[PDB]
Every structure is written in structure tokens, then in C-alpha cells.
Amino acid sequence: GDLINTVRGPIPVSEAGFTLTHEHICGSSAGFLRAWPEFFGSRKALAEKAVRGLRHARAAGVQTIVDVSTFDIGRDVRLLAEVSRAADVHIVAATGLWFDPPLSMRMRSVEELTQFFLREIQHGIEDTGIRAGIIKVATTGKATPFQELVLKAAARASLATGVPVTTHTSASQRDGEQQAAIFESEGLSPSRVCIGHSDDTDDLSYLTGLAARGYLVGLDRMPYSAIGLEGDASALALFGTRSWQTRALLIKALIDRGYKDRILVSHDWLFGFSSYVTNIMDVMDRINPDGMAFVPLRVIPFLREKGVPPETLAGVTVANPARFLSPT
Numbered sequence: 001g002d003l004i005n006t007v008r009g010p011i012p013v014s015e016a017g018f019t020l021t022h023e024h025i026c027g028s029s030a031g032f033l034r035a036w037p038e039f040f041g042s043r044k045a046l047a048e049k050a051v052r053g054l055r056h057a058r059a060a061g062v063q064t065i066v067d068v069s070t071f072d073i074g075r076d077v078r079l080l081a082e083v084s085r086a087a088d089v090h091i092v093a094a095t096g097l098w099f100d101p102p103l104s105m106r107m108r109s110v111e112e113l114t115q116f117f118l119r120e121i122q123h124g125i126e127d128t129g130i131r132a133g134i135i136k137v138a139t140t141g142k143a144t145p146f147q148e149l150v151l152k153a154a155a156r157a158s159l160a161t162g163v164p165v166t167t168h169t170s171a172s173q174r175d176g177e178q179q180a181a182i183f184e185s186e187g188l189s190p191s192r193v194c195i196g197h198s199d200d201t202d203d204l205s206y207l208t209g210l211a212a213r214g215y216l217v218g219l220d221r222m223p224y225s226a227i228g229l230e231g232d233a234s235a236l237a238l239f240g241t242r243s244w245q246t247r248a249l250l251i252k253a254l255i256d257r258g259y260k261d262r263i264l265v266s267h268d269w270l271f272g273f274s275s276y277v278t279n280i281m282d283v284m285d286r287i288n289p290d291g292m293a294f295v296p297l298r299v300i301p302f303l304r305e306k307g308v309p310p311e312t313l314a315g316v317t318v319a320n321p322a323r324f325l326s327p328t
């Protein structure tokens, strides 16, 4: 009975089960869902859509998602409690900062960031009492000077509390390596850290370099492909031109090289998206109507059929998430 915090309260680690470890109920901005609920039709329409989508993943075998929306992704922890109950799926919430932090965060020192993250982990997000169970952090290239601070503060808050840290990278620019240097300079154990979006590159030199050091490797955009959408300039920059299979192969690729224990797999999916072009979410829904059941329905059986054994895939979808989220 080691235990982790979800938006409905504590749970036993061993009940986390099949866990998608990089997901979003809604990709937004701080204060936005409350200032402009209609952007999304309504708070009510959004919740109902999350709920339908999560019951879908849940039918498919998913029991937990980790919602890595930070303050600046507009994390609404009330909405997460409310879809979590309605759909009967555990949702682990996040602290940390993504790459859209407002001036109130950007003016802060490493010491004050660390107080902010610890607050959300140890006391509760906002006035709610709901505790973040993962720390989210981000670079898009060389870490900006403020990003260095967030990363060091992320590492301190993790050593204090034992909550894992997880990251956004621009994977083509091999951010994970800097990211790891910064965390390591703070004494953080690589097995407390997941380097995310790593399925955005096919650079296995890069990926096995991280895995070999003990980092978890987040293969977390499985359904993101813009094949057949070549005249959709915003779809392209976001989805890329590699297929879902090409991504799913990375998983086998690491398993064949002995790195089964260092993989986490997810969709980086959402049910609403205000922080990009208008209607991106219709686009997304056409390219992947399965939303967050895409991994269990498409990716696992594809792995099974390329000869990956079931015990191995269990270790990836259950054991690794469990090892990772377990406060250490």
C-alpha cells in the first residue's frame, strides 16, 4: 500500500492499473475556461465530451490518466474532479509550468517556484485541497533562463516530496539532454524523470542515451499524424508527417534494445484546445475519433502482432507508470 494522489483523493498505487501518463482534459490558459467558457460551447459541453471520451478509454482498459496541465495550461482541477467521477477513471493532476508562464511566474526566483510547486503538491491546488501528483516542466530548444529556474525548482520539489517530474521537449532539438544535465546538477534521480514527446524524433542515439542513464522515455503522441492534411499548415506544424505506426515502432525499438522498463506511452490527447488555432479540435477528432482509447485499441495489438509479448506490454502500461508515480 504505497499511495498516489488523484483529483478524487488518495489511491493505492496498485489500483492505478493501465495508465496514460501524458494527457489533457483541456489544453487552455490560466483563467480562460472561467473567463470564456463559450469558447468551448460551454463548461457543460466540455465536461460531457471529456466524460464520453474517458468512458470510451475506460471500456478499452484504461483506468488512470495523468493530466499534465500546469497552471499555464489552464488546469481546472474542479473540472478534473468532475469528469473523473462521472467516467470512473482516475485522474492524477500536475503542478509545474509549461512554456506559457505569465509575468507573475516569470519574475520568480528558483526559491519561490519551489514554494509554488510544493504548495500544490503538499497543501492543495487553489482553495481545493486536491494535491498535484506529478511535476510538469518544459523547454522548446535551449532552455530560456526562466526555464532553467523552473527545472531546478521542479527538481527540488521532487526531492522534497518524492513526486516524479515529466517534461515537454522539442524532440528534434534533443532538449532531453540539457534537461537531464540541469536535473542531475540538482541531485535528482533520473528514474524520477520522464523525458516527454520523445516519439517526435526517430533519433535512437538520443533516446537510448537517455534510457541508458535511467530516464523514463515518454513516447506520448501516438495518434499525432497529419498524413492526408498537407494543405493544413497549422495541422502540419503540430501533427508532423510521420505515421502512428512509425511512432509505435519506437516502442518496439526500445524494447528490442533492452529498455522495456524505461518506456511510458500516452496520446497527449485532449477534449478541448484553446491554446492553438480555432477548430484544431475538430481536425483532431477526425484524425483520431478514438481519442484516448487509441493506444489500447490500435497501438497495443499492433505491438502484439509485431511479436511483443503480453507480459512486456503489461510492464509498459501498468508497471512503469506505477513505478514512476509512486512517491520515492
Ligand SMILES: CCOP(=O)(O)OCC
Pocket: 024, 026, 027, 028, 073, 168, 268, 275
Ligand atoms: C496543452 C497543449 O500543449 P502541448 O501538450 O504542448 O500540445 C500538444 C497537443
Ligand SMILES: [Co+2]
Pocket: 168, 169, 197
Ligand atoms: Co507538450
Ligand SMILES: [Fe+2]
Pocket: 022, 023, 024, 068, 268
Ligand atoms: Fe501535453
